[PDB]
Amino acid sequence: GLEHCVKIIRQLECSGHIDKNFRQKFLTWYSLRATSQEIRVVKDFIDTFIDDPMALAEQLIDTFDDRVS
Amino acid sequence: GLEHCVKIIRQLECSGHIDKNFRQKFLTWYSLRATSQEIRVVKDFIDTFIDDPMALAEQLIDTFDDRVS
């Protein structure tokens, strides 16, 4: 769950769909703060936007940018 | 796990991406306090930012500086 999330989130950053700031904020939040239920949301989004990294990035931002800041 | 983490953390210090203080604080925290789950986060970050030591350093600081101080 963690391994996979980190890899994808780096991939998005490297591909330019998320900025460095959000990646850093997000990984911190996911690693420590994010609750069991909140991890299930993230896992679920990742699986839904497989071939659509742009839509995934936009979704993670829309859902979690407030919580991670 | 420990051996590898220590080597990387020293490498970052010696390369100037982390200061001496944080290295010392971090090794203490990792050696003694850090929980099973917290070690998995560290291991995972290290593996993600191999070729980007600046980003690794910035990530470890963002995630762990509070816990190690």
Tell me if B17 sits within 8 A of B54, measured CB to CB: yes
> In sequence order, what are the residues at sequence separation of 6 or more whose Cβ sits closer than 8 angstroms to the Cβ of residue B47?
none
- Residue written as token pair 């769950």: A1
How many residues are recorded in chain B?
69
How many residues are recorded in chain A?
69
The residue ranges of DSSP E strands in A3-52, in sequence order, are none
Give the pair of three-digit tokens for residue A39. 């991890």
Through-space distance between the first and last CA atoms of chain B, rounded to whole angstroms: 22
> What are the structural domain ranges in chain B?
2-64
Taking the CB of residue B28, how many other CB atoms lie within 10 A of it? 12
Tell me if B66 sits within 8 A of B48, measured CB to CB: no
Chain B neighbors of A3, CB-CB under 8 A:
44
By Cβ distance, the residue of B44, B58, B62 closest to A2 is B44
- Residue written as token pair 């993600």: B48
Distance between CA atoms of residues A56 and A51, nearest Å = 9
Distance between CA atoms of residues B66 and B2, nearest Å = 21
> In sequence order, what are the residues at sequence separation of 6 or more whose Cβ sits closer than 8 angstroms to the Cβ of residue A14?
none
By Cβ distance, the residue of B40, B48, B62 closest to A28 is B62
